């Protein structure tokens, strides 16, 4: 038995001796080694112990994938691989520079939050190869099992450690990049708290001395780059939110989308099929038509799909030889994907009395939502619709009151709000904290209705209003402004406090859009209803 | 040697061989007397039985594959079109290709049957698997071998039985996948829908990574919305349509009639069945887009016929319309539209339902200073709110058109809308609701045989509705004369084949003032 | 049997030899020892027996952590670590002083309620440095389960034990410092 036992033990010996192993691990392994020497071959413990040896030897103790320091080359890889993302490109360059001063490996915890299908997933995949790290994707989503992360108890025969340990078995690097997805969409279970398990990772101190239920050994993850993805910010748990730095990954306008589609989408779709450029050719105009009329998404997941289908119908044609070799033009695209889905961008051409087009940062991303009001024949009343939270209800009350207030101050001869029963509708999609954002918009509607002078054509406006008519800053100007542009707006009205955020945008985004900044509502009235 | 008999022929990857030889060496060291020896033998057998390097020879001969689909099923042009892309694409790859395709639609439309046909066309192994109301992950990810009565997942069982790494997986009824104590099964499903995990999928029993990419995954749904969000974004969608009587007629004749005869083994001459019989068999025995009803009825006639032939009391079976009662008795569904003449306050509506294209009515009534509305039904929050908008729109609208009438503004109204419509298609009846209240107002009913749909804004802009295809099928089946759709739904309407849209007086509207001028004469 | 059963038995005993273990504990573990020898090797219950036995011996008993209790050093450490917070400084140096005079260790419960990011937690670590006490952290925010502290019954399969014992298993000593946080959001 003893001769064969030595060979079993020696195969683990050769594995560990090539690693830079911590002192406690050898003491652990020798104890496990000593048991195996006495334990019989048929023993259940013997198998699990041998299993345990495989797990610990699989751990890359002091094995770093050499991270290369080249400002230009890091940029080059990111530049060719992805369009745009100035903020994230700069943050990743920054990560290089810091790591450079160390002259050693570096770890950190970041979030990529933005609308879906804008390339969050894709960017992180590029980082790993760019920085010569082994790439990994891991999913928390709505998973309730804490054991997925912290592992199961060792003593249970056949039990396995956490999947992050399993990652290091595969990747054979102590310096991986781990992408964790949809942390905003965290699950709740009786079995444990995944939130706390992840908080062991996000806490820098706990990160350096992470433990597993199977492994029973403090591992070091201080050099591991953790990458979070989210769609919205508020739904992330507070401890996770404040032990980590958030980066906004924006949606795309027409022009950006178009360069994405030409440079990446189209060759990815061609490489997916196996076609050649000589075989399938689209046009700039084709994609303009595809973007404008056959996609409503902030990102390009949906436009990716539409490009996809186009090449699929082209592929079929070539094999069969049904037509001449595919050149695609606006006139003949109908055969490939069909008739225009969206013929108009917004709910009206011209707003009738008492309807305002407002802006909203939805969970998905930017959109336009109209607001509309209505009359029913001693004190007046307001009725309100949508899945309005208690917060917005109150805000609307205040809006309603402000509206009333403003009417007396301006035109006291009129009596509209104050002796008539009024109903307005506010469409849903707006997040809890983004709900107050259309307060002043409500106001506009009630006043609009009063005189029966309609809001001047294709004017937008967003902001919160106080009870005496002072406008508050609103979040996510980036997203709301994208939205206005998509839905063909000409003139926009914003809080004076949001001036910073609007002028942080790119040239091609803000241009063609005559902006106004305002601080109080009396300014807005002079814009929306001139004479 | 017995294990080697599989390993020698079936070319095994590196990491797998490593587990196998370790297990095999362990088996040799372990005493045959021990129970754990048999555990190893069972484990080794599983590993050897699983195919390695036996990808099915993919017959990418497009011309032959075309014919196979066409003969097996009627219509289904869109679905076949997607499949025929698949071979063509696979040709440009020059190798096997793996993709995930969804057939949502009404029950008994042919999702399961078509799945069979693709398998035939591609010469792939047809494996059938069912989640339904699955609550446990162990069906997919297997049970850990350490526990008593442990068996690996059916996916793993599939590979063993099919002896190929290029099967076709049918995984039906994913839209209503269950949830339970052990967690969310949807997590395991995401492991199947992602090619990234397919290449390295592992089991709690198998304990070995396996590449199950390049496999055509087929799933069926009944409704789109109910499918989990992470699966839905990842998923590729295919609509599979309903059928009118004339379509259904052809299906019976070409397929169902001979299929029943084939299943019964009966000669065609023996048990003659005619077209006219089936015309009645549709109009009087079915009121849904599915052919489950028509299939059971043809079965019934032929099952009785089998008895008739064998016994010899009628050794020649011929069916005529006057002789149908002999096999099926009297007509089950005598009438089609449950109001022949709509009284005031009643209107005809349209809905999309899980069971398929549906036909529903909407009615309002009185109850006896401000008016009131009591919306009733198992109705959701959205529909309640929409109804308030509808009601408000009704109010708005009446002062505009005829201000002297104070009916709906002062009196108390009760409203009822039948259920079945998915939450998503719940608001679609919004437009009809208004029609009902105005109808109630002047007491002049809507013009006869008029069906109508659409969401309405508080100011009266109409909005587009989903699944118009199925809605129009149902309105034809219930025999409407005239149909009013939203102007932005004009896309869907002209997409339809001409034979369904024959004899429908369609009108397109943007705003409800148009509906009011159409539904009421002057 | 001496190869597997006795090996498990022995390794755990000479582990416990240096620990000042109460009488009631020996009787429990000795019964477990008798059980391990009695029970079949390959049974699931053996693994659970071996599981329970391991945890019993791993936990320290009467292994009291030592401290310098030089008060001058203690105050210096805390002043060097943080600015402000004289009140909490004052309280904790009173605690060492009280402990010192008693000529024995002391276990009391103290709480810092403060606005977020003010330094409650970082102070915790300063205390541990000053006090030579082992540190540990545990959160209760948004938490709704007794069983993560009180433990699951060792009879069950997939049983998850008490949190507190894991700390004691980590520390391998008594006289620990535990930070319990988000107590108001329980
Ligand atoms: N700036 C960009 N440069 C290159 N590709 C991009 C860019 N923005 C989006 N994409 C593409 O759009 C798609 C978005 O998919 P993905 O990143 O998986 O979505 P999500 O961001 O929701 O995780 C990818 O296929 C990616 O190639
Ligand atoms: N368009 C069609 N062409 C041919 N057969 C059809 C068609 N639609 C339905 N069938 C018949 O339906 C039968 C079973 O339908 P099935 O696949 O169970 O429907 P579903 O998947 O919707 O439940 C098949 O044996 C087939 O002959
Ligand atoms: N008195 C102090 N002197 C210096 N830094 C302090 C002081 N109090 C807090 N800090 C800083 O606070 C941070 C830690 O705050 P933390 O204890 O996590 O906040 P909280 O009290 O909400 O738990 C550190 O970056 C630390 O330097």
| B345's tokens | 């306050």
- Give the C-alpha separation, A373 to A73, whole Å: 57
A199 vs C contacts (CB less than 8 Å): 139
Q: Are A284 and A258 in contact (CB under 8 A)?
A: yes
Q: Are A403 and A417 in contact (CB under 8 A)?
A: yes
- Give the C-alpha separation, B271 to A424, whole Å: 67
Q: Give Cα separations from A284 to A261, A264, A324 (angstroms).
A: 9, 13, 21
- Give the C-alpha separation, C49 to A275, whole Å: 63
How, if at all, do strands B271-272 and B237-239 pair? unpaired
Q: Could A319 and B184 be called an inter-chain contact, meaning their C-beta atoms sit closer than 8 Å? A: no
Which stretches of A236-343 are DSSP H helices? 238-241, 254-260, 266-273, 284-294, 301-320
Whether C47 contacts chain A with CB within 8 A: yes
Q: A241: exposed, middle or buried (C-beta count within 10 Å: 0-12, 13-18, 19+)?
A: middle
C-alpha angle with apex A414: A408 to A417, nearest 5 degrees? 75
- Give the C-alpha separation, B275 to B264, whole Å: 20
Q: Give Cα separations from A417 to A214, A385, A455, B498 (angstroms).
A: 68, 18, 17, 53
Which stretches of chain C are DSSP H helices? 5-16, 23-38, 44-58, 71-81, 86-102, 120-131, 147-150, 163-171
Strand stretches in B388-481, DSSP E = 412-416, 450-452, 455-456, 462-463
- Give the C-alpha separation, A26 to A16, whole Å: 9
Q: Which helix (H) or strand (E) holds C118?
A: none
Q: Are C179 and C186 in contact (CB under 8 A)?
A: no
What's the residue count for chain A?
531
Q: Say yes or no: CB of residue C113 within 6 Å of ligand 3.
A: no
Ligand 2 atom nearest to CA at B107 = 22
Alpha carbons within 13 A on the beta-carbon side of A126: 20
- Give the C-alpha separation, A203 to C140, whole Å: 16
Q: A131: exposed, middle or buried (C-beta count within 10 Å: 0-12, 13-18, 19+)?
A: buried
- Give the C-alpha separation, A202 to A110, whole Å: 9
Q: Are B476 and B504 in contact (CB under 8 A)?
A: yes
SS3 A359: strand
Please state, as a whole number, how many other Cβ atoms lie within 10 Å of the Cβ of residue C115: 6
| C157's tokens | 């399969």
Buried b (16+ CB within 10 A) or exposed e, A437-474: bbbbbbbbbbbbbbeeebbeebbbbbbbbeeebebbeb
| A102's tokens | 């160390």
- Give the C-alpha separation, B305 to B319, whole Å: 10
SS3 B447: coil
Helix (H), strand (E), coil (C) string for A417-452: HHHCEEEEECCCCECHHHHHHHHHHHHHHHHHHHHC
Residues 6+ apart with CB under 8 A from B179: B135, B185, B186
What DSSP line would sit under A301-318, residue for residue?
HHHHHHHHHHHHHHHHHH
| A118's tokens | 């804008």
> C150: closest CA among C160, C136, C137, C140?
C160
- Give the C-alpha separation, A152 to A52, whole Å: 13
Cα-based torsion angle of the residue sequence A43, A44, A50, A52 in order, rounded to the nearest 10 degrees: -150
Ligand 1 atom nearest to CA at A252 = 8
Which stretches of A39-119 are DSSP H helices? 44-58, 71-81, 86-102
Q: B496: exposed, middle or buried (C-beta count within 10 Å: 0-12, 13-18, 19+)?
A: middle
B36 vs C contacts (CB less than 8 Å): 42
| B392's tokens | 């408000």
- Give the C-alpha separation, C120 to C130, whole Å: 15
Question: What radius of gyration, in Å, describes the C-alpha atoms of chain A?
Answer: 30
| B405's tokens | 């009438």
Question: What radius of gyration, in Å, describes the C-alpha atoms of chain B?
Answer: 29
- Give the C-alpha separation, A386 to B141, whole Å: 42
How, if at all, do strands B317-318 and B271-272 pair? parallel
Please report, in range form, the residues annotated as the binding site of B for ATP: 105-112
Q: Are B351 and B425 in contact (CB under 8 A)?
A: yes
| A475's tokens | 């979040």
- Give the C-alpha separation, A439 to A358, whole Å: 10
B35 vs C contacts (CB less than 8 Å): 42
Residues 6+ apart with CB under 8 A from B252: B278, B281, B291, B294, B298
Q: A497: exposed, middle or buried (C-beta count within 10 Å: 0-12, 13-18, 19+)?
A: middle
Strand stretches in B82-190, DSSP E = 100-104, 125-130, 167-172
- Give the C-alpha separation, A85 to B90, whole Å: 35
| A132's tokens | 């010569």
C-alpha angle with apex A282: A276 to A284, nearest 5 degrees? 135
- Give the C-alpha separation, B384 to C4, whole Å: 70
| Residues preceding chain discontinuities in chain A with C to N over 2.5 Å | 377
Question: Hunting for tokens 């770890």 — which residue is that?
Answer: A107
Q: Are B359 and B477 in contact (CB under 8 A)?
A: yes
- Give the C-alpha separation, B177 to B227, whole Å: 8
Whether B36 contacts chain C with CB within 8 A: yes
Q: Are B349 and B361 in contact (CB under 8 A)?
A: yes
- φ, ψ for residue A112, nearest 5 deg: -105, 95
Please state, as a whole number, how many other Cβ atoms lie within 10 Å of the Cβ of residue C113: 8
- Give the C-alpha separation, B288 to B297, whole Å: 14
Buried b (16+ CB within 10 A) or exposed e, A314-330: bbbbbbeeeeeebebee
- Give the C-alpha separation, B430 to B415, whole Å: 12
| B447's tokens | 């013009």
Whether A43 contacts chain C with CB within 8 A: yes
Report whether A473 belongs to an annotated binding site: no
Helix (H), strand (E), coil (C) string for B23-73: HHHHHHHCCCCCHHHHHHHHHHHHHHHCCCCCCCCCCCCHHHHHHHHHHHC
Q: Give Cα separations from B447 to B94, B340, B480 (angstroms).
A: 61, 12, 11
How, if at all, do strands A135-139 and A177-181 pair? parallel
Q: Give Cα separations from A395 to A359, A392, A438 (angstroms).
A: 16, 5, 9
How many angstroms is it from B290 CA to the middle of ligand 2? 8
Whether C11 contacts chain A with CB within 8 A: yes
A385 vs B contacts (CB less than 8 Å): 385, 388-389, 458
Maximum distance among all Cα pairs of chain C, rounded to whole angstroms: 64
Ligand 3 atom nearest to CA at C112 = 21
Ligand 1 pocket list (CB less than 6 A): A 82-85, 116-122, 260, 264, 300-301, 304
Residues 6+ apart with CB under 8 A from A418: A379, A380, A404, A407
Q: Are B438 and B459 in contact (CB under 8 A)?
A: no
- Give the C-alpha separation, C168 to C10, whole Å: 22
Task: Find the helix packing angle between A439-451 and A390-410, rounded to 10°.
Answer: 40
- φ, ψ for residue B317, nearest 5 deg: -100, 115
| C54's tokens | 């391991």
- Give the C-alpha separation, A251 to A298, whole Å: 5
Buried b (16+ CB within 10 A) or exposed e, B73-92: beebeebbebbbbbbbbbbb
Q: B20: exposed, middle or buried (C-beta count within 10 Å: 0-12, 13-18, 19+)?
A: buried
> B142: closest CA among B155, B130, B132, B133?
B155
Q: B258: exposed, middle or buried (C-beta count within 10 Å: 0-12, 13-18, 19+)?
A: middle
> A16: closest CA among A54, A72, A64, A47?
A54
- φ, ψ for residue B423, nearest 5 deg: -45, -40
Q: C43: exposed, middle or buried (C-beta count within 10 Å: 0-12, 13-18, 19+)?
A: exposed
- Give the C-alpha separation, A478 to A502, whole Å: 7
Q: Least CB-CB distance to B459: which of A116, A158, A374?
A: A374
Identify the bridge partners of residue B397 per DSSP, sorted by sequence position: none
| B245's tokens | 């009587």
> B105: closest CA among B220, B248, B194, B263?
B220
Strands laid side by side in the A225-230 sheet: A135-139, A177-181, A225-230, A108-113, A245-248
Question: Hunting for tokens 């063909």 — which residue is that?
Answer: A488
- Give the C-alpha separation, A331 to B219, whole Å: 35
**Chains with ≥3 Cβ pairs under 8 A against A?**
B, C
Q: Are B244 and B477 in contact (CB under 8 A)?
A: yes
- Give the C-alpha separation, A439 to A416, whole Å: 19
C-alpha angle with apex A18: A17 to A23, nearest 5 degrees? 55
- Give the C-alpha separation, B274 to C106, whole Å: 98
Task: Find the helix packing angle between A163-171 and A44-58, rounded to 10°.
Answer: 60
Q: Are B298 and B257 in contact (CB under 8 A)?
A: yes
Q: Give Cα separations from B154 to B50, B83, B168 (angstroms).
A: 12, 26, 14
- Give the C-alpha separation, A81 to A128, whole Å: 12
Query: In this structure, which residue's CA is closest to atom 5 in ligand 1?
Result: A82
Question: Hunting for tokens 């606005």 — which residue is that?
Answer: C115
- Give the C-alpha separation, C149 to C163, whole Å: 5
Please report, in range form, the residues annotated as the binding site of C: 114-121
């Amino acid at each position: 038995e003893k001769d064969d036992k030595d060979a079993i033990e020696e195969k683990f010996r050769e594995r560990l001796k090539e690693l830079v192993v911590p002192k406690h691990v050898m003491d652990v392994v020798d104890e496990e080694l000593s048991k195996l020497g006495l334990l019989d071959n048929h023993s259940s413990e013997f198998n699990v112990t041998r299993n345990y040896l495989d797990w610990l030897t699989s751990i890359p103790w002091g094995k770093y994938s050499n991270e290369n320091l080249d400002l230009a080359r890091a940029q080059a890889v990111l530049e060719e691989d992805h369009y745009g993302m100035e903020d994230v490109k700069k943050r990743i360059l920054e990560f290089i520079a810091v790591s450079q001063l160390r002259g050693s490996t570096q770890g950190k915890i970041l979030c990529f939050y933005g609308p879906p299908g804008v390339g969050k997933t894709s960017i992180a995949r590029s980082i790993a190869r760019a920085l010569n790290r082994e790439y990994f994707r891991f999913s928390v989503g709505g998973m309730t099992d804490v054991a997925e992360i912290k592992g199961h108890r060792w003593t249970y025969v056949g039990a396995m450690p956490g999947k992050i340990i399993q990652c290091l078995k595969k990747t054979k690097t102590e310096n991986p990049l781990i992408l964790i997805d949809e942390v905003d969409m965290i699950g709740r279970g009786y079995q444990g708290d995944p939130s706390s398990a992840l908080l062991e990772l996000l806490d820098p101190e706990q990160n350096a001395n992470f433990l597993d239920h199977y492994l029973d050994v403090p591992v070091d993850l201080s050099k591991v780059l953790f990458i979070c993805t989210a769609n919205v910010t508020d739904t992330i748990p507070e401890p996770l939110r404040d032990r980590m730095e958030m980066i906004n990954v924006s949606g795309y306008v027409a022009q950006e989308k178009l360069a994405i589609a030409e440079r990446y989408l189209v060759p990815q779709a061609r490489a997916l099929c196996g076609l050649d450029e000589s075989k399938a050719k689209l046009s700039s105009d084709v994609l303009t038509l595809l973007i404008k009329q056959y996609c409503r998404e902030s990102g390009v997941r949906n436009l990716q799909k539409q490009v996809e289908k186009v090449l699929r119908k082209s592929a079929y044609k070539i094999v069969s030889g049904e037509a001449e070799s595919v050149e695609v033009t606006p006139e003949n695209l109908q055969d490939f994907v069909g008739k225009p889905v969206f013929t108009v961008e917004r709910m009206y051409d011209v707003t009738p009395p008492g309807v305002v087009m407002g802006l909203a940062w939805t969970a998905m991303g930017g959109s336009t939502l109209f607001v509309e009001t209505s009359l029913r024949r001693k004190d007046g009343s307001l009725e309100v619709t949508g899945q309005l939270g208690e917060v917005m209800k109150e805000s609307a009350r205040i809006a309603y009151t402000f509206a009333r207030a403003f009417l007396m101050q301006h035109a006291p001869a009129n009596d509209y709000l104050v002796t008539s029963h009024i109903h307005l509708h506010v469409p849903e999609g707006a997040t809890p904290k983004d709900g107050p954002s259309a307060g002043c918009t409500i106001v506009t509607a009630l006043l609009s209705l009063a005189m029966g002078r309609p809001v001047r054509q294709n004017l937008a406006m967003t902001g919160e209003v106080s009870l005496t008519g002072k406008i508050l800053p609103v979040g996510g100007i980036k997203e709301k402004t994208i939205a206005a542009k998509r839905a063909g707006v000409t003139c926009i009205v914003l809080p004076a406090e949001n001036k910073k955020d609007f002028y942080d945008l790119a040239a091609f985004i803000t241009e063609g859009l005559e902006v106004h900044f305002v601080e109080h509502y009396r300014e807005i009235f002079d814009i929306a209803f001139p004479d």
